[PDB]
């Protein structure tokens, strides 16, 4: 291409009709309560250090607009596929492992995840729910670093969703300025994806 890739990044999107969706056994969280969540985070912080989380943003197109694939628990709770990196693990290899754990097929046929773009970073300064897209100045030791990547999909694929979750294709306008519905990270994705030159195949 003529422009530097830093100035213009082009991404192939495929229509939602190119993809199929199944279900598999439920996948339960490592922590059974918020209290238990932050207790483990604290213990791992002392034993290992900062938690390293990676999440993937998977995009399809329908009706002229990019749609992000979200995991829904229940009515109101939404998350990106991803999770915790192991000590020393490469971020990209780690996200591919996690995507396979979460959405991989029971019949062993592998998805081909392509991950060439960081879209943002969120930092948890304390053992508490708030996260910011920067490290506050008084915090030299954040407790969690969450890194978001665009995951380029193959032209066609089957995604197997743990049956305790629903996979939804959310259009960008549903997310935009909707922190009450989706939280600050998901609701910022329209902004974070705006730089990409999407090709609607």
């Amino acid at each position: 291409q003529t422009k530097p890739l830093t100035l213009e990044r082009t991404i192939n999107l495929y229509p939602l009709t190119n993809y199929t969706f199944g279900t598999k056994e439920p996948l339960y969280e490592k922590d059974s309560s918020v209290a238990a969540r932050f207790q483990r985070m604290r213990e791992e912080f002392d034993k290992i250090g900062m938690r390293r989380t990676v999440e993937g943003v998977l995009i399809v197109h329908e009706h002229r607009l990019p749609h992000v694939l979200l995991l829904q628990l229940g009515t109101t709770f939404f998350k990106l596929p991803g999770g915790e990196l192991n000590p020393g693990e490469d971020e990209v290899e780690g996200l591919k492992r996690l995507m396979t754990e979460i959405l991989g097929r029971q019949d062993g046929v592998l998805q081909d995840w392509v991950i060439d773009d960081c879209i943002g970073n969120w930092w948890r300064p304390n053992f508490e729910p708030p996260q910011y897209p920067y490290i506050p100045a008084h915090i030299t030791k954040p407790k969690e670093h969450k890194k978001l990547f665009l995951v380029q999909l193959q032209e066609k694929a089957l995604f197997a969703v743990p049956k305790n979750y629903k996979l939804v294709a959310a259009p960008l306008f549903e997310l935009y300025d909707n922190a009450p519905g989706y939280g600050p990270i998901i609701s910022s994705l329209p902004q974070l994806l705006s730089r990409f030159n999407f090709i609607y195949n």
Binding site: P125, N126, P130, Y132, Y134, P136, A137, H138, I139, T140, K141
Partner: protein, 96 residues
Amino acid sequence: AAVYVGSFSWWTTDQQLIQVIRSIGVYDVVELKFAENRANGQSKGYAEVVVASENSVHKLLELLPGKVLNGEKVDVRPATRQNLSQFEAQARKREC
């Protein structure tokens, strides 16, 4: 057991507070919790220092007051509801 320490700038760090605490011989800090604006994470310039022992609370109360963080001398008080109210009122009075 815990104390409040303040007041200091919003760029006074966790590491600077832990180093001054180490400098008075206290090594059992269980938690440093800065008072923060939740909306944007900015420090409001005081913190709760939680320690494992009353021996450390005694040391903090005697040895830490007067020490300097980024040009300011710190006050240290027991972590009671009254003292929290007073630190927060001071922080609100600085925000202006």
